[PDB]
């Protein structure tokens, strides 16, 4: 993947957004923006240029799964990589993420190494 790939980090908890952003920076990905929920995220996505989405599962107004579906059903954004982040891995949620088209699924908190590992699995799958 290109070091300048533009990421959108979505979470209603500001501290977690900062942490994910810092983890991305640690891996050399500096082009990162933030959104506080699914609605805010879609609003900023309408601006264009985004190449990767990392979204939390539980957020008000529009949660992670709802954001993911919206992206996948949109003609311009349908192929965007989306890594889902959750507080707890659950069978039902995992199957739901698969059905909706999640590129990845990871439990927080996670280290830089783990993030790197999840991103690389997605890049490889997508030939990025």
């Amino acid at each position: 993947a290109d070091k300048e790939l533009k990421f959108l980090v979505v979470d209603d908890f500001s501290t977690m957004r900062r942490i994910v952003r810092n983890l991305l920076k640690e891996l050399g990905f500096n082009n990162v923006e933030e959104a506080e929920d699914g609605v805010d995220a879609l609003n900023k996505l309408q601006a264009g240029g985004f190449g990767f989405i990392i979204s939390d599962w539980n957020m008000p107004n529009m949660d992670g799964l709802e954001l993911l579906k919206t992206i996948r059903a949109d003609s311009a954004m349908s192929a965007l990589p989306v890594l889902m982040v959750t507080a707890e891995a659950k069978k039902e949620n995992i199957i739901a993420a698969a059905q909706a088209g999640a590129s990845g699924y990871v439990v927080k908190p996670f280290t830089a190494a783990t993030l790197e590992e999840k991103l690389n699995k997605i890049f490889e799958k997508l030939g990025m």
Binding site: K91, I94, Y105
Partner: peptide, 13 residues
């Protein structure tokens, strides 16, 4: 946990 982990592994997550 073992099962959750195997599910994730099977799905490529």
């Amino acid at each position: 946990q073992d099962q959750v982990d195997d599910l994730l592994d099977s799905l490529g997550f």
